[PDB]
Amino acid sequence: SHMTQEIITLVQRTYEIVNKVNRNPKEEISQIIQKLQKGERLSLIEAGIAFANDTEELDQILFWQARKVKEEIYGKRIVLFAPLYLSNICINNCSYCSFRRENKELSRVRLSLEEAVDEAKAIREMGHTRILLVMGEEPEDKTLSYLEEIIPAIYSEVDIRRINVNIAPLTLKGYERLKKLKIGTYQLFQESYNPEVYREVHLDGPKTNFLWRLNAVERAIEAGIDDIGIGALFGLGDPLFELLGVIAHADYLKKKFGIGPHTVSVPRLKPALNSVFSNDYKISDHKFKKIVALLRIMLPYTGIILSTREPQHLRDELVELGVSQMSAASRTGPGEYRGERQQFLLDHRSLAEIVEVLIDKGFLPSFCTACYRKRFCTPDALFSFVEYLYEIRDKHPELYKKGNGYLLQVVKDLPNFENIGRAIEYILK
Numbered sequence: 001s002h003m004t005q006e007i008i009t010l011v012q013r014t015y016e017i018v019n020k021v022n023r024n025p026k027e028e029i030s031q032i033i034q035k036l037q038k039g040e041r042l043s044l045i046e047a048g049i050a051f052a053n054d055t056e057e058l059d060q061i062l063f064w065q066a067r068k069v070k071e072e073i074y075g076k077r078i079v080l081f082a083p084l085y086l087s088n089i090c091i092n093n094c095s096y097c098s099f100r101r102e103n104k105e106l107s108r109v110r111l112s113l114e115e116a117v118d119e120a121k122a123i124r125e126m127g128h129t130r131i132l133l134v135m136g137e138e139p140e141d142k143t144l145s146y147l148e149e150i151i152p153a154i155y156s157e158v159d160i161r162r163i164n165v166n167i168a169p170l171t172l173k174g175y176e177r178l179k180k181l182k183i184g185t186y187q188l189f190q191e192s193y194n195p196e197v198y199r200e201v202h203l204d205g206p207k208t209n210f211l212w213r214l215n216a217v218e219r220a221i222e223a224g225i226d227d228i229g230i231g232a233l234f235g236l237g238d239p240l241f242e243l244l245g246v247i248a249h250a251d252y253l254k255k256k257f258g259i260g261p262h263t264v265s266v267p268r269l270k271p272a273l274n275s276v277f278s279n280d281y282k283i284s285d286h287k288f289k290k291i292v293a294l295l296r297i298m299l300p301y302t303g304i305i306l307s308t309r310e311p312q313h314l315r316d317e318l319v320e321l322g323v324s325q326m327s328a329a330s331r332t333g334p335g336e337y338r339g340e341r342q343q344f345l346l347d348h349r350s351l352a353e354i355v356e357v358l359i360d361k362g363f364l365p366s367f368c369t370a371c372y373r374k375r376f377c378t379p380d381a382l383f384s385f386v387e388y389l390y391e392i393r394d395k396h397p398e399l400y401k402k403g404n405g406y407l408l409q410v411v412k413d414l415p416n417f418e419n420i421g422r423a424i425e426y427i428l429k
């Protein structure tokens, strides 16, 4: 009944309106603040104002509400996954990325079946059970055949609970082919919802098509895939507009198919190899926290993924404010887990370390999925973390003890989970 194009019109009008409201925001701001105190639902425009304007009261109450919501739906739970880069060759040529075709400065590698499977083994040995397959864009038949041989091989040869997919837009037939591979979630980032900056930053290849990428998730849905992931690259254009666009997009999906997006991925634009993107929008840490906050409060039952590597202190603040999924010990280059290739110029950090840090900041690391996507549910996460701890009992004993103790504390925090506590203590000797 509706078409994707409508979104861009809406978010456009909104983006205009908000900007007018930007010069007399006082009154508006006030009412918004009240809406945040009462815990009332908030609208697109008021969200726009909430982002655009930086005042002490507004930001503090916004963050407060964000933490309250994240706690109410997700608790102290943070889901961990590792991205597996299968190939860094591509047809397209965006200004911002390292994988762009005109780069030349990049070691172009595509992984054999044995190599990819070995990468899955290396990621699994770490303790990870969730993988995000990521590739540069090749022709449809190419990539889909490649994955048609690789994904079931991973499922069978390795103990991976979920394979998520970040592959360039496909045809309906292609998505019908992908649904047969039994993938978990299909993630496709719009990168930008402004056609004027989308045209600006995407220079060569099929990605130059705005609409073909915009209703890609629609095709993914109608082809039988129910779990999808939106995303918007921040720093490409005016952050207000992209933030507006994501919420409008999820809204649209919810209205059209009755199911919203499983996850919204929010990556800020990072330093790249031989990037030629000059014009920039500096995404400040504060404003970033504002984006994840507004996203958490606007789409509460929608998971939020932190794809980009962030410093610890900010990372776990973002986890506090809405983020429900995280990339830990991530390798951003194909073939490196075993094993310049990479997409980001990164100082690899160890999974056990960040699990330690997470457990000290009071967070519950998980390796399970099935969050609330089906429609507290702590048990599944509890036991995923239990399995992790048991897997690393010999690698790091002190971490095993610390983890056990933490789990005991959480278990005593909830009286409805007595038998769960007994079971957990049985499992860990």
Ligand SMILES: C[S@@+](CC[C@H](N)C(=O)[O-])C[C@H]1O[C@@H](n2cnc3c(N)ncnc32)[C@H](O)[C@@H]1O
Pocket (backbone or CB within 6 Å): 096, 097, 098, 099, 134, 135, 136, 137, 166, 167, 168, 169, 188, 189, 191, 233, 267, 268, 269, 270, 271, 272, 308, 343
């Ligand atoms: C490697 S692409 C894989 C999927 C597919 N090639 C596509 O374009 O949709 C993964 C994501 O990394 C993000 N990315 C690319 N360059 C980036 C950069 N320089 N800084 C931050 N994120 C970037 C893009 O948003 C892209 O969707």
Ligand code: SF4
Pocket (backbone or CB within 6 Å): 089, 090, 091, 092, 093, 094, 097, 098, 099, 100, 101, 135, 136, 137, 168, 207
């Ligand atoms: S942005 Fe994605 S599709 Fe474009 S060159 Fe980079 S990896 Fe390939």
Ligand SMILES: [Cl-]
Pocket (backbone or CB within 6 Å): 164, 184, 185, 262, 263, 369
């Ligand atoms: Cl997921």
Ligand SMILES: [Cl-]
Pocket (backbone or CB within 6 Å): 310, 311, 312, 313
């Ligand atoms: Cl750090």
Ligand SMILES: [Cl-]
Pocket (backbone or CB within 6 Å): 309, 327, 328, 329, 330, 349
């Ligand atoms: Cl990382």
Ligand SMILES: [Cl-]
Pocket (backbone or CB within 6 Å): 126, 350, 351, 352, 353
């Ligand atoms: Cl480790």
Ligand SMILES: [Cl-]
Pocket (backbone or CB within 6 Å): 395, 396, 397, 398, 399
């Ligand atoms: Cl240790």
